[PDB]
Design a protein around this ligand. Structure first.
Ligand SMILES: Nc1nc2c(ncn2[C@@H]2O[C@H](COP(=O)(O)OP(=O)(O)OP(=O)(O)O)[C@@H](O)[C@H]2O)c(=O)[nH]1
Ligand SMILES: Nc1nc2c(ncn2[C@@H]2O[C@H](COP(=O)(O)OP(=O)(O)OP(=O)(O)O)[C@@H](O)[C@H]2O)c(=O)[nH]1
Ligand SMILES: Nc1nc2c(ncn2[C@@H]2O[C@H](COP(=O)(O)OP(=O)(O)O)[C@@H](O)[C@H]2O)c(=O)[nH]1
Ligand SMILES: Nc1nc2c(ncn2[C@@H]2O[C@H](COP(=O)(O)OP(=O)(O)O)[C@@H](O)[C@H]2O)c(=O)[nH]1
Ligand SMILES: [Mg+2]
Ligand SMILES: [Mg+2]
Lengths: 150, 430, 430, 430, 430
């Protein structure tokens, strides 16, 4: 059973939909990633992170601040699992914290999405029904899921 | 050498000086009879900064006391250390201003100021090398805010290259004791920006807040506020009177804290401050001093410093301590708070170390930071001024002594322009 | 019949001069009173009977440090009228100490220099010490160098400047005067050695295991480096090196003379004797990037030439056997047009220990002076810091009002750009 | 190094600390004036674990005292060793909670906790290397069981990697002093399992039983129960303050006694305990200590340990003794009682030896065992909770301050799930 | 010109290193201060004048033991900065000392190893001591061995590991890290010697007649074994043996290098001299199964090769006459493919006695290092203990949360299964 789960990932990471978020994540470098990077630059620990990477703290702050947690990802461990799954091949060099070199943060966001279908799964079901989710309906669905999860 | 003279005006300034000189005398071991009884050799090496020498070996402050009424100086003389002041320096009128700025700046203050300017000129011409002047006065009173500011212009006209300090108490809207405070505050701020090289605002509301929250004493009085202001005043010039690792006179602070000539309004704070019951719990370390130094409630002004970004900052450490720790802590306080520091000027914190601590304390810090958060005080002062002026309330008192509304309009416009151009740099980006 | 004159200007310069002058007096057996209870002639002069007088002059506009010197234990050593002192400090303003108050003092200093030079018969050259990030230091150093370059001409001058750290800083305006002083000494000084404080702080923390260092600990290491550099002039050695034998060995081109130093071993008596301190291990430690005396990474650039001094009981064959090992390593690469880049000096006198200090007594030591292409990073970061504030013309009014022209800032920027282009042009292989 | 800070809340916790600190001070020879008067060198080597250093050479505990009413801290100050506590660490409100969990956790405890968290952060940021925190509080009171548990979550959120201890007194149904004990016990157990790294339950009923049966003293008082709890508390960290054959910090016990992250509720006991009249009859030997250590009546909880099977056990021997005897006795106590030890984890007893015995005793043992018999306490607490909740008795007091019945239902369900999954491993077989 | 470096990591390693370093200093006549009041060169180094410095390094993350070392009588012997100490203990967690805190310390240890190795010219190999059932010991030993195997390559390393007893245990989680460390050193160490405590306890009880032994008595016997093993490098002998002459004589295959030791005679002075201690009787006692230094029965398996060292006045013919008798006995059988299995060494220096110790002074002694097929039982029982708790994944969360992967436990199990299959495959006759 364990071998089968391991065999199961990596294909999802290579999908165009995930890469587009991460393709859009290139645009996050274009603006969202530049803002996150600018927040990572406010961390003095930046000397330990590559100039093109974001820290786990900045990625967790992004997930919290953009309501990815708790609305889309109900469990904060899933953010850590996403981050670790994206950065899995990076070795810790010279005791420096592992940054999002291009996408361990993008891989962590995929694990949050996939890890817990939750708020984002409800948004996907509503969108598949042809219901245009306005921000007030999204907030209400997120509040209802957060109440069911607490 | 490089000494300064003391000039104070008004009742508030006289009460501030009455404690400032007591603090200085206690620091230098001078008895209230003018006789030295100190313990350390360093207590006498640089005593020429504030004290003159007379026959008989006694010392006399080079202070000049002025007011439009004789009561306050007749009262300060009977207080402790009141005999040090030379009787010749006392100049006063027989009428008073009645908290009217026009009377203390146009009609009555103009005729009297010649006598006080005579003694001011006598004091400055004589001294070895002048460093500058320091002024204590209140913006909430008529005679003070008028005569002091006109004297500022008269002194600046004759000594354009010397440095000028002003410790100014501005009227807060929370604790208001005079109804005509906005008028003479707004009129005074207009003249103060044009001539003062440095200005340090102090608020009674912030002093009460500090006394109630940090010291936690039950019944604050003017003596405690004066003592805090006096300690803050003494902390600035400590390294000019004592040796240290990095001496830094007033001119060096002027160079490093004023980016543009019109931005010279600072707010200050003193650390450490602890209650009587908790003075044994705490341990004095550089991290403990620096965490209290940048605390928002520790500022001597009600202005909230996390509502804006610091243009620059300064710290004057006292006592014997390692410089490496000071520098690393200054770096740490600037890396963890990058959002509140302007980004187009890097390394905007100045530090200095003096090896002589205050009497009774092992370490002390004086903080002087130029921040954009000071705009809120001028905003509320101008708001009250324009609320009262639109109906021409109390205007006849001022207009009956040769003043007109045009000088009010120009003052309001210049003050609003100052408010705008002070925040212009807050939104500036590189 | 060989002499050298050391110039100390500014607070940092005087505080490192004190540090080197305890060490020299201790190394030549001279008591602090100046009395002995033929190698002294390099730094001292005989008065005919008894005391010795240092060939040094102390300069400062701010009198506190000189007054501290004239009352300490060394009051009897220095000649009373070579401790030139001013009255008014420049206050971190470069234009002040180059145009306003330094000009009236520079004539006395030049007269003292002439009076000291007429005594020497075999004058090797001048030494100068100045902290760059200050007004009087940088300004007076620039003016003195400019006067000496024309009064004497081809005599060699060596500058031990202390540049600001990459991120740690004490002032807020030091990039401006650092850039201007680099402009001034680029075309006027034969050798400049990098000495920023952060690297030496890290050295003390890692090796000396001191968690709270002060300036004295830094100055003692600098004094040891100076003593190691000048030992070859006053002690017998198997392979001597003179000061004039530098521009022929370390300076490939007239523009490129900024190099960074290192020292080894640095160790405390508590764990020094447990290990043998062989020549191979000390010469390996000297080349470690973490032991650079300036916060620059040599792995980021090529080497041009390495001049490295030994002292103690070292044997030349062991030195050659260690130079070969360094040439072997793949992490250290020299420039293409330099097949051999090492100049080696060997002296017999072991380094002397100062009582109550940090360093222990050892029989072998190594001091390296290495010229490398990686030094351009400090220029680039100082330039970036300068541009941020010069974009908005901040703090410029403090300089324009002291007689300096508006365009003087731009040409220093152009010279730094030229230097950075030159460093890139030299480092490319043919 | 690896030191911990003390935080206590409520009246019961304050009374426990008032004896714990007396015991620690007597162990380290600290007089009630903070002056060391000890005899042995080892008494000062590791004093940084619990005590800070201040000027004048006196020592001050790093304890933080909090309560919602000022009476208990105003009373503990007048007791012996009451002057050691720093007055700054005393934080209190003016209202109190009235044994209502909602008031001490939602309305009143939320606003006050910022001030105590400020001093907690001050204490933790400063210390050399943090080991963790230890918490003393009672589950039978409102303000304690509310504010302490919310503070647990707040501390855990900021220091996720440090270790956290809690010594919790749970309300027994035998000696009941408050009618609303089940509500705030059940609400507190819900939050305590999620954040505390270690929890140690203590019952007043077991303390009375021990005092009446083993010590056989006529009139027990709270001072004796506090003394027993204090001795047990001190026994855990003894080897962290003194040398020994096998040092074992708190983290090592955490590794070896918690198999799964949710099973961290231990019950403890102290040996030896003998009556005054029989203290001469007994001879202190390792067999005598180990036979009393595993005695059922010696446990500090009314839970009967032969009603379940030990998952693991720990012992912290004190004094100088042979290790071979300790190991063989531990093996013997595990071979003769194989029925009461779970079989799928072999060798489930941890031992440690510290060479410094308690003052006045030659040998001592502290026992910490994780057993499945603890389920009975949660069973009876939940039984009383569900007997009282089904009628919604006293529910309006809690529901009038923003709380609802849903949080009661979730707490009951989670507590029952904990009870079930704790016994799940009792029936598990290999 | 022959040297060896000993590595001590963990509490057990340091406590056995102390035991061996009293013995070596006593055997070479060096006082505890390090001063003598050409055989020393194997373990020591000459400093030029006076004291000797051991070629040993002490490692631990928990500072208590090192601090005890640095204050005892041997404070002057060891170099101050080769006693590397951490701040936070691994707390019996293997993942901590291999992934979290050991990595930041391992670099300093490797630097010290290089600094010690550059001094040696004829380095024979390394010795390492570590108690396996602990976090820091096993983890740091694994990491150091893995770094050394690639930094130096073919240099020989010897490991004196102390495995847990069959039933006696101090921790509850030691099988996990024992199995992981066996995995790590299986492919990284050239020789591993078995040292479990229970067998040595039985030896002390039966022969030394001590009923209450402590760890020091065990460590003294281990130190005597080490001295007997390394005597041949520093004393003249008729039949010498070097460290490099082992894998050619005791290691049939690269995987099989775990062997168990024995020593004889072990006897107290009260009854030692009543019997003649002939070579035949001591060599018979050495082969007795009850005198094995590890709790394994040699009667349960074949022998592969026996390397056994003598010292004293033994004559080779008497040794041969005793090897013949052992070959005669029917209870000791060798493997089929090994006709001769004995390697004999003879040395002249009798074993030295430590004052106040247990062993008496004798003229003849024998130490055997024997490789036998029966060693697989300890692996089988450790594997059985591991499987019981790994079936339910107990205590795994303490390891997964310290950076280790889930699958890392399985491959150690597979390697142990491979080793057990290999031991069975080798022992079958052709
Ligand atoms: N290494 C070292 N640097 C120092 C020392 N003292 C001051 N500095 C450096 O000098 C810089 C400022 O110049 P200073 O020497 O302090 O003052 P100055 O050169 O006399 O110039 P003025 O401010 O006009 O008096 C600071 O940034 C410090 O880094 C010292 O004792 N040792
Ligand atoms: N022979 C012998 N074994 C010891 C001694 N001290 C500890 N041990 C063994 O070491 C095992 C645990 O490892 P320790 O050495 O005590 O501790 P550690 O190796 O430093 O690992 P940590 O617990 O993380 O500090 C125990 O099971 C003991 O059997 C000793 O003095 N002699
Ligand atoms: N710190 C301090 N402030 C004072 C004292 N006395 C008056 N003030 C302030 O001064 C203000 C009134 O100023 P005023 O006496 O009219 O100044 P004047 O017109 O120059 O005499 C009030 O708002 C007070 O807050 C004092 O003793 N200490
Ligand atoms: N051991 C001990 N227990 C006490 C003491 N005082 C009170 N208690 C226990 O604490 C319980 C009441 O707790 P309470 O005082 O209401 O806690 P609070 O609400 O935080 O103030 C009672 O059941 C007592 O058994 C004491 O001095 N020692
Ligand atoms: Mg200066
Ligand atoms: Mg240990």
């Amino acid at each position: 059973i364990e071998k089968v789960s391991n065999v199961k990932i990596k294909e999802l990471f290579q999908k165009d939909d995930v890469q587009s978020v991460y393709k859009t994540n290139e645009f996050k470098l274009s603006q969202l990633f530049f803002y996150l990077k600018k927040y990572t630059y406010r961390e003095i620990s930046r000397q330990n992170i590559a100039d093109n990477e974001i820290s786990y703290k900045t990625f967790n702050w992004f997930c919290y601040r953009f309501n990815i947690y708790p609305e889309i990802i109900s469990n904060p461990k899933d953010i850590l699992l996403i981050y670790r799954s994206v950065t899995r091949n990076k070795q810790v060099i010279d005791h420096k914290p592992i940054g999002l070199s291009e996408e361990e943060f993008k891989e962590a966001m995929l694990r949050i999405s996939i890890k817990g279908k939750k708020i984002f799964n409800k948004f996907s079901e509503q969108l598949q029904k042809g219901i245009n989710l306005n921000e007030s309906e999204m907030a209400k669905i997120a509040d209802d899921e957060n109440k069911e999860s607490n | 050498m490089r000494e300064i003279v003391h000039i104070q005006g008004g009742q508030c300034g006289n009460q501030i000086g009455a404690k400032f000189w007591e603090v200085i005398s206690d620091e230098h071991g001078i008895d209230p009879t003018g006789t030295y009884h100190g313990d350390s050799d360093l207590q006498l090496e640089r005593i020429n900064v504030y004290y003159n020498e007379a026959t008989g070996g006694r010392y006399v402050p080079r202070a000049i006391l002025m007011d439009l009424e004789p009561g306050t100086m007749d009262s300060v003389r009977a207080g402790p250390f009141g005999q040090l002041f030379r009787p010749d320096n006392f100049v006063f009128g027989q009428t008073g201003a009645g908290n009217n700025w026009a009377k203390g700046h146009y009609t009555e203050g103009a005729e009297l100021i010649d006598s006080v300017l005579d003694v001011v000129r006598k004091e400055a011409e004589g001294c070895d090398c002048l460093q500058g002047f320091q002024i204590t006065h209140s913006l909430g009173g008529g005679t003070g805010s008028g005569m002091g500011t006109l004297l500022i212009s008269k002194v600046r006209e004759e000594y354009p290259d010397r440095i000028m300090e002003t410790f100014s108490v501005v009227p807060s809207p929370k604790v208001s004791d005079t109804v005509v405070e906005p008028y003479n505050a707004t009129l005074s701020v207009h003249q103060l920006v044009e001539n003062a090289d440095e200005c340090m605002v102090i608020d009674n509301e912030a002093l009460y807040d500090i006394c109630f929250r940090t010291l936690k004493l039950t019944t604050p009085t003017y003596g405690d506020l004066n003592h805090l202001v006096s300690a803050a005043m003494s902390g600035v010039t400590c390294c000019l009177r004592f040796p240290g690792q990095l001496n830094s006179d007033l001119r060096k602070l002027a160079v490093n804290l004023i980016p543009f000539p019109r931005l010279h309004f600072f707010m200050i704070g003193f650390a450490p401050l602890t209650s009587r019951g908790s003075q044994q719990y705490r341990a004095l370390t550089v991290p403990e001093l620096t965490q209290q130094m940048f605390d928002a409630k520790n500022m001597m002004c009600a202005a909230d410093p996390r509502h804006g970004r610091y243009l620059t900052a300064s710290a004057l450490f006292r006592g014997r301590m390692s410089t490496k720790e000071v520098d690393e802590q200054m770096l740490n306080v600037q890396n963890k708070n990058s959002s509140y520091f302007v980004e187009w000027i890097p390394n905007n914190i100045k530090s200095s170390i003096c090896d002589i601590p205050p009497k009774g304390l092992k370490m002390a810090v004086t903080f002087v930071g130029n921040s954009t958060a000071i705009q809120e005080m001028f905003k509320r002062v101008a708001e009250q001024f324009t609320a009262m002026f639109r109906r021409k309330a109390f205007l006849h008192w001022y207009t009956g002594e040769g003043m007109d509304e045009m000088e009010f309009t120009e003052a309001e416009s210049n003050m609003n322009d100052l408010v705008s151009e002070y925040q212009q740099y807050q939104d500036a980006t590189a | 019949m060989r002499e050298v004159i050391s110039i100390h200007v500014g607070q940092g310069g005087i505080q490192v001069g004190n540090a080197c002058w305890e060490l020299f007096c201790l190394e030549h057996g001279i008591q602090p009173d100046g009395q002995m209870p033929d190698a002294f002639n390099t730094f001292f002069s005989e008065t005919g009977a008894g005391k010795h007088v240092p060939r040094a002059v102390f300069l400062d506009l701010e009198p506190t440090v000189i007054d501290e010197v004239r009352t300490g234990t060394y009051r009897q050593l220095f000649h009373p009228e070579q401790l030139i002192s001013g009255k008014e400090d420049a206050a971190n303003n470069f234009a002040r100490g180059h145009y306003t108050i330094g000009k009236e003092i520079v004539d006395l200093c030049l007269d003292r220099i002439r009076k000291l030079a007429d005594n020497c018969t075999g004058l090797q050259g001048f030494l100068v010490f100045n902290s760059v990030g200050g007004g009087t230091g940088s300004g007076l150093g620039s003016l003195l160098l400019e006067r000496l370059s024309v009064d004497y001409g081809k005599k060699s001058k060596l500058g031990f400047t202390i540049y600001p750290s990459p991120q740690v800083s004490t002032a807020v305006v030091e990039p401006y005067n650092s850039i201007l002083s680099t402009h001034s000494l680029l075309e006027h000084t034969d050798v400049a050695v990098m000495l920023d404080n952060e690297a030496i702080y890290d050295i003390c923390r890692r090796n000396l295991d001191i968690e709270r260092p002060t300036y004295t600990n830094l100055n003692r290491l600098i004094a040891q480096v100076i003593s190691s550099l000048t030992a070859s002039l006053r002690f017998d050695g198997a392979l001597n090196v003179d000061i004039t034998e530098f521009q022929t060995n370390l300076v490939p081109y007239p523009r490129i003379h900024f190099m960074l130093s290192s020292y080894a071993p640095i160790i405390s008596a508590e764990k020094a004797y447990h290990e043998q301190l062989s020549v191979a291990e000390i010469t390996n430690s000297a080349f470690e990037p973490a032991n650079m005396m300036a916060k620059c990474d040599p792995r980021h650039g090529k080497y041009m030439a390495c001049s490295m001094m030994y002292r103690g009981d070292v044997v030349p064959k062991d030195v050659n056997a260690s130079i070969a090992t360094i040439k072997t390593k793949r992490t250290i690469q020299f420039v293409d047009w330099c097949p051999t880049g090492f100049k080696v000096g060997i002296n017999y006198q072991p380094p002397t220990v100062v009582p109550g200090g940090d360093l222990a007594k050892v029989m072998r030591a190594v001091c390296m002076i290495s010229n490398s292409t990686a030094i351009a990073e400090v220029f680039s970061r100082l330039d970036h810091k300068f541009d941020l504030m010069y974009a908005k013309r901040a703090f410029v009014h403090w300089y324009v009002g002291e007689g300096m022209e508006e365009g003087e800032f731009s040409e220093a920027r152009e010279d730094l750009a030229a230097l950075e282009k030159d460093y890139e042009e030299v480092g490319i292989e043919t």
